[PDB]
């Protein structure tokens, strides 16, 4: 993405931005899954009727991962749009 924002580069015109954009999205997607997967598991932990309030505290880190992952995704999206615009300009 850094090489694709003008340079000094790339020398992969646009194409690079599209690739970079997907990678950020995938990165975000992976992050969303990992956080969720980890999260899903703890909530189920039946223990067992008078908890969950109660029970534990949870995330925590999750929250951050919940925010960080989201942020990452957003960034990826932005990158993708940038590449798209670049592509448009070339055409």
């Amino acid at each position: 993405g850094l090489c694709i924002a003008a340079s000094e580069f790339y020398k992969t015109r646009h194409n690079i931005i599209l690739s970079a954009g997907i990678f950020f999205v995938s990165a975000g997607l992976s992050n969303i899954i990992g956080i969720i997967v980890y999260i899903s598991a703890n909530a189920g932990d039946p223990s067992k009727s008078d908890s969950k309030k109660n029970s534990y505290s949870y995330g925590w880190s999750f929250y951050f991962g919940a925010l960080s992952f989201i942020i990452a995704e957003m960034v990826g999206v932005l990158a993708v749009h940038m590449f798209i615009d670049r592509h448009k300009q070339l055409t």
Binding site: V80, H81, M82, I84, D85, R86, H87, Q89
Partner: peptide
């Protein structure tokens, strides 16, 4: 090109806010 991505992101967000044959985005 940057605004063209904003107008589209708002269009896909409208295609998101729920309700041709480009097989890719079709499925």
């Amino acid at each position: 090109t940057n605004e063209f991505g904003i107008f589209n992101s708002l269009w896909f967000s409208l295609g998101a806010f729920m309700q041709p044959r480009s097989l890719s985005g079709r499925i």
